[PDB]
Amino acid sequence: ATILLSAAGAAIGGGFGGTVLGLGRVIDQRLLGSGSQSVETGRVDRLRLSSASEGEAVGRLWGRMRVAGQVIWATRFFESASYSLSLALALCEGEILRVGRVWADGSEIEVSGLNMRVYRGGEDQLPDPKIAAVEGAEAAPAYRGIAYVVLEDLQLAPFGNRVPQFTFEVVRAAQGALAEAEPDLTRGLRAVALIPGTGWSDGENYARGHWISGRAVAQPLASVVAEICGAAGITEIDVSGLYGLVRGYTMTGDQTGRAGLQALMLAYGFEALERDGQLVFRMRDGRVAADLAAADLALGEGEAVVETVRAAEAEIAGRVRLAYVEAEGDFEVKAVEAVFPDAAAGAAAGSELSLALTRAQAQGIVGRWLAEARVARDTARFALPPSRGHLGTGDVVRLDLPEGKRRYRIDRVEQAGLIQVEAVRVEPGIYAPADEVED
Amino acid sequence: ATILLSAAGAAIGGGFGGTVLGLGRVIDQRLLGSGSQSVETGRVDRLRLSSASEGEAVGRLWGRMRVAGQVIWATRFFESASYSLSLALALCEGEILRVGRVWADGSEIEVSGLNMRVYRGGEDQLPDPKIAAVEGAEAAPAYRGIAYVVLEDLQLAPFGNRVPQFTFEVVRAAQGALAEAEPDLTRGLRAVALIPGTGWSDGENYARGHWISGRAVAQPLASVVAEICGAAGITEIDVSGLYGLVRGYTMTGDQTGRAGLQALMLAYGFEALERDGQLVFRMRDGRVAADLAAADLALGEGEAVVETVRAAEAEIAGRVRLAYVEAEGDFEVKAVEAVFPDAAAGAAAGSELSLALTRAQAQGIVGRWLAEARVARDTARFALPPSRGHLGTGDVVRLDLPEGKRRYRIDRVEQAGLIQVEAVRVEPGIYAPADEVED
């Protein structure tokens, strides 16, 4: 007997379920290009609160960034007669540097007032804190990986009498097998000293000064993306072409692995190329590798030497926005925007990045996207012969035409013995410092 | 070499990504019909709270409706010795009428107790409030578009000592180039007076009384939909066929433009027709323009003169629901439902409209949808010749048959020189007042 209109049903499931197996987002997709599908990424956490449940995941972070933590092993309320507790707040995993500048619900509490005992969460397996001798040694938990902070005889008097939501500035050095080789500051320094001293003051040259207070924490972008693939298990990871400072990224547990990495591909713009099995992560530039003439393209599928698509004017992202974290002061969600002067009439396209970066840098990034997303309107769809197959999937083609000589970075190489390319328009001058003043 | 089963992959992306480029929802789709895809719309805000972050968008509203506002420029807590602040809460954009009936966290505070200075947010660029001479004149912000309300020497004593969430009744007149032409009450009145006076009392004839207290605020539906396309930039907008009162609609910033408008297409039901480049917004009626006989249809694609689809009984929306705002009393989220007497056994389909309307009107709307969604089960799919091409995309066809003579409003006209139509069944008696009693 014949078939019904579940011919449309078998066309979907699993007719299209096989695809995504083997495979605000308003601005996330244009920056990756045709590329691949941009996974939902980094709904930035504002009002960081600590939930004491059993279903919250272990967070991870790299550098100076506040994290909420959560309660593990709180004793009963103790009335001195006007209360007292013994908390232990677990921040993040891995060996960390020390936790300073604790502030609870509200503005600020002085850490000298507290009796906190910070712990690195060392794989060395730090023993029991002995404040858990309330429980006793025989049931004292001895957390190996996670970096918990206990609190001792905490007076609940100044903040009500309820438990306040504590939030902790944490400094975590990037770890992993690629990180222990090639040591950056956080252990590479091996004794700096030279404290300038010589005592409201002269901090106008701090952004250009030789001294390294504050910014010694920030990990290079090379090892943090190496930490992601290390935790995911890819040790074949190649990352020598990366040049960036992280300064406090933070993704939670069960953040897909790649969706934590994909926020970095919007900020620093790097390729995630994978020429060979190395998965080369190179920083994206305009350095042209191909120099094709128009005479040197192959015969494509659609029988056009170069199909050139220019995207709609009604969707060009006239103004772009961020949701970065303040990273110098009290870590709070902020926003800058870049507005193109001719067409400001609409198309607001913003996204949220959960990392922490300064004020002139955020206006630099959004100034870079608004230029790039209007440059990346043009896409090219051509086929080039396997006579020059050394055009890796992330290279950029000069592509001489009779009218233009416009560069093109390429995506979605599908070859089978005929390299067919979905390029995208990329200029070299996009990837520069914006050189803006600071706050 | 051959191709893989990414033939299913290239069938999706961007094989189907080109479509939505050039293009509770349970009841939203049936009311627009085959029509077009109903965008997610109006998750109604209950517990209106004010967040003092930097990532919340500028709200917009039209008429008497409470809005949360947010904090901009709060001074430090001042202890008289038992606290004091200097807030400024920014409500919405555009020139507004005055803000009355402020109520904070909780029930109600008397505005005579406050020292608030309301501001219209005039494009005339209102100067500094001089309460920001705390900051000084040289850094005093002088907000042009947004309508902020400062608060002066606010005692935080009655509501705890924390800052309470303030919520403000705001009256905003519909603006835009189509609104300044054809003035309605809010400036059209040009002096009414005639205060009845002649002093629990006789308000049983207020809904039928000649006096205009309260309902003088409510803007006509013609200019509010003109304000949307004006802010979106369509000045070619045609709206003379609209007849409705808005009474306090509210969409936030980044509400897509159209998704704010699409809530009105569910309430007042209007076409958004676009015969010509005017984009005619006409109110939907049953006024028949076509009078086709069965002999006068063209030869379609499927080689059937009229394909008639009747939708499933298991999905007819047996009971429909709303989430309107109270609009007379303390503005709170409410709900009414209309239940069809024969089939009440299931299919609850509700949606949420963020506008404000009275009690007999809400039961009128849900009484209209439950009738319409069961009428709009029948859809017709026929083709009519270009000999009568003056059937615009939103007209309604009599469509004489041998058995029935059932009307059909049309959608999805695709012509290319053969006008092929996906109609939908529409009766005239649906669009009437329900004539119900009030609360």
């Binding site: - | 069965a294 002999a295 006068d296 249809l297 063209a298 030869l299 379609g300 080689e303 003169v305 010749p385 270009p386 000999s387 020189g417 053969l418």
Partner: protein, 134 residues
């Protein structure tokens, strides 16, 4: 576009060709029809030319496709079938002639041609369709 020559003189019996129209049509399924014409003119659309002479004629014919041809040039075409009107109806033809005296400038409807050898000196090619681009 050229004004170069008519053609080689030889044309075999069977050189077919007649005017075209788009005239898209709806065929109203329950009665008569209604149909539109956007042309006001007609592409003459000559087909099925055949060169048949010695091989001395072939090398001036294969490069007829090549030299002044390429793809995109005129080579005014001779019809064996300044404004000409047709008065045999009470309607009118009134169809213009950009070239003089039935010369109908065309172009070949081929990506390639195919000349055959039939004997020591026989040169044949089966078809060269044209459409008379303006």
């Amino acid at each position: 576009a050229f004004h170069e020559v008519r053609f080689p003189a030889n044309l075999s019996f069977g050189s077919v060709g007649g005017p075209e129209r788009r005239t898209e049509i709806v065929t109203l399924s329950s009665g008569h029809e209604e149909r539109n014409s956007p042309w006001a003119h007609s592409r003459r659309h000559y087909d099925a030319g055949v060169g048949l002479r010695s091989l001395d004629d072939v090398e001036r014919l294969i490069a007829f496709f090549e030299a002044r041809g390429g793809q995109l040039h005129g080579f005014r075409w001779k019809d064996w079938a300044g404004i000409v009107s047709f008065n045999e109806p009470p309607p009118q033809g009134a169809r213009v002639t950009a070239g003089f005296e039935f010369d109908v400038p065309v172009r070949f409807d081929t990506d390639r041609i195919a000349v055959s050898v039939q004997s020591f000196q026989a040169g044949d090619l089966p078809q060269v369709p044209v459409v008379e681009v303006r």
